[PDB]
Amino acid sequence: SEQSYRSAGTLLAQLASGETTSVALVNHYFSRMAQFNKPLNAVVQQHYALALEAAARADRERLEGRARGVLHGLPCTVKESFDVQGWLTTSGAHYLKDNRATQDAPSIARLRAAGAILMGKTNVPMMTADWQTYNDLYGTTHNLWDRQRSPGGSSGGAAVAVAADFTPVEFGSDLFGSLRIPAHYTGVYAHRCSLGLMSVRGHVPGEPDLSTAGPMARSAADLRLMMRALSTFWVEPPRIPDFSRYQAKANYRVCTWFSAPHHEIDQQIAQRFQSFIDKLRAQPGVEVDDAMPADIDPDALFDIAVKLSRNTDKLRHEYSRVIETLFARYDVLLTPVSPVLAFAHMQQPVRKRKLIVNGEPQDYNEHLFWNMLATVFGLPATVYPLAKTMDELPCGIQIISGHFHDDVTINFAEFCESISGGFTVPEGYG
């Protein structure tokens, strides 16, 4: 099979029905990386021989009725900073250029046990500590929509690989937007899981207290499929998210938070959000309120975020109660991921890095402002690609909900797919 941009869900169906095999899929993805990865520099380790062997095994198992696992026979790549047994985990640092993992990171092991075929790893900035993706070991990852621009970071290689169909899904860590920001800039879906829903151990730098992890994909159903594979609670659940299937709702009540004093977004995002909200407000049973609680001072929360990045705790626990009541009244909260769309590479020292909002220079740390909320309170957040004209860059929206409401945000993204937005194939790719 040579068809490009099939979803994981479709691919699993076609494996079951014999319209494709795992060997044909591994050859598809490595073929696309041969044809397209050089100018993008998204996949920085390739393990073809191991992947082809694993695919042959999956195919034998399928034929003999011995296939097991919800990802059985599905190839993928993972973020370079997660341990895969026998593979290098450099995190783009010279000090670790020959650091090879002894065992899988626990979430990697859980993809492998679901039957995923790991074909390689995708680029990260050094120690995954930036909102761009570049390092001295592997080079810069370029945004496939405009290669003079960054796909963001730290999961930038993963977002580009998904958007180029080098892989149907990806898996990465998210501290302050590490998964969400590259999804926004690059036009793919991402889900950062609730704190405690899945292990982030076996990550370099990397059970961490703020970092979570989750999938990238090109549909909401594929995000849900990954979470079926990945979820292993290590906190006591306040409730059990249901990842079994899309659960459609008759009523949605949505909160928006698109600006704060001194934290404005570019008018282009503002108009594209407004156009999306207009369509959402026109749906039966849907209310959309501009109802961010004023109880949460954004500057106070930013100061907490800056500190984390007996007194702060006091405020943090009080704000977490304001969020619980918020998500008893609203199903989801929609916010920006960044105040800008994808920018040209900025590898100067941090201090000199600017984001141009409505013509004015703004702080690079606006990335932290628009991602601290889910990070600080351990919340789930799905990033959903909005529509784009061929003359527009990708733009995502961040769908947040209460702790262990991961099913709610992913279900909300699938409902949005019926309204506006979704994955768009970049011009020049399959």
Q: What residue spans of 246-359 are helical by DSSP H?
A: 267-281, 298-308, 312-329
Between CA 62 and CA 16 the distance in angstroms is: 8
137: three-class secondary structure by DSSP = coil
Residue 277 C-alpha from the chain's centroid: 22
**Residues near 63 by Cβ (< 8 Å), separated by ≥ 6?**
none
Between CA 242 and CA 408 the distance in angstroms is: 9
Give burial (CB, 10 Å; 0-12/13-18/19+) of 98.
Answer: exposed
Owner of token pair 């995954």 = 128
Between CA 122 and CA 105 the distance in angstroms is: 16
Handedness of CA 210, 111, 170, 51 (dihedral sign): positive
Strand ranges for 80-147 from DSSP E = 117-122, 134-135, 139-140
Show the CA angle centred on residue 31, arms to residues 29 and 34, nearest 5°: 110
HSE-CB for 156 with a 13 A CA cutoff: 34
CA-closest candidate to residue 58, choices 104, 24, 8: 24
Residue 415 C-alpha from the chain's centroid: 18
CA-closest candidate to residue 395, choices 259, 221, 267, 286: 267
Between CA 313 and CA 300 the distance in angstroms is: 12
Tokens of 233: 């609670």
> What is the DSSP pairing of strand 43-46 with strand 117-122?
antiparallel
377 with 325: CB under 8 angstroms? no
Between CA 20 and CA 78 the distance in angstroms is: 23
Between CA 219 and CA 86 the distance in angstroms is: 31
φ, ψ of residue 197 to 5 degrees: the values are -90, -5
Residue 156 C-alpha from the chain's centroid: 10
Owner of token pair 């995502």 = 396
Tokens of 20: 């494709």
Between CA 398 and CA 382 the distance in angstroms is: 6
Instruction: State which amino acid sits at residue 70.
Output: V
Greatest Cα pair distance, the chain, in angstroms, is 63
> How does DSSP classify residue 149?
B
Instruction: State which amino acid sits at residue 11.
Output: L
144: three-class secondary structure by DSSP = coil
> How does DSSP classify residue 340?
S
Between CA 23 and CA 206 the distance in angstroms is: 33
Sequence spans of domains, the chain: 8-230, 252-417
252-417: CATH, from 3.40.50.2300, 3.30.830.10, 3.20.20.10, 3.90.1300.10: 3.90.1300.10
186 with 152: CB under 8 angstroms? yes
What element of type H or E holds 396? Answer: strand 396-400
Tokens of 397: 């929206």
Using what technique was this structure determined?
A: X-ray
Contacts 24+ apart (CB under 8 A), 28-35: 28/1, 28/2, 28/4, 29/75, 29/119, 29/165, 29/166, 29/167, 30/119, 32/4, 32/164, 32/165, 32/166, 32/430, 33/120, 33/166
8-230: CATH, from 3.90.1300.10, 3.30.1440.10, 3.40.50.300, 3.30.365.10: 3.90.1300.10
**Residues near 89 by Cβ (< 8 Å), separated by ≥ 6?**
80, 81, 82, 83, 96, 99, 100, 101, 204
Please identify every residue annotated as catalytic.
79, 154, 178
Tokens of 202: 């076996």
Between CA 91 and CA 128 the distance in angstroms is: 7
Where is the chain discontinuous (C–N over 2.5 Å), named by the preceding residue? 206, 309
* Resolution of this structure in Å: 1.9
131 with 340: CB under 8 angstroms? no
83 with 91: CB under 8 angstroms? no
Tokens of 87: 């593979």
Owner of token pair 């106070």 = 300
In Å, what is the CA distance from 158 to each residue of 140, 155, 249, 256, 383? Answer: 13, 5, 31, 28, 14
> How many other CB atoms are found less than 10 A from the CB of residue 346?
18
Dihedral angle over CA of 417, 423, 427, 429, nearest 10 = -130
CA-closest candidate to residue 175, choices 367, 321, 326, 393: 367
Q: Which residues pair with 174 in a beta bridge?
A: 212
Between CA 41 and CA 139 the distance in angstroms is: 7
Tokens of 166: 């080098």
Handedness of CA 148, 150, 151, 156 (dihedral sign): positive
> How many other CB atoms are found less than 10 A from the CB of residue 363?
17
**Angle between helix 220-230 and 106-113 (nearest 10):** 110
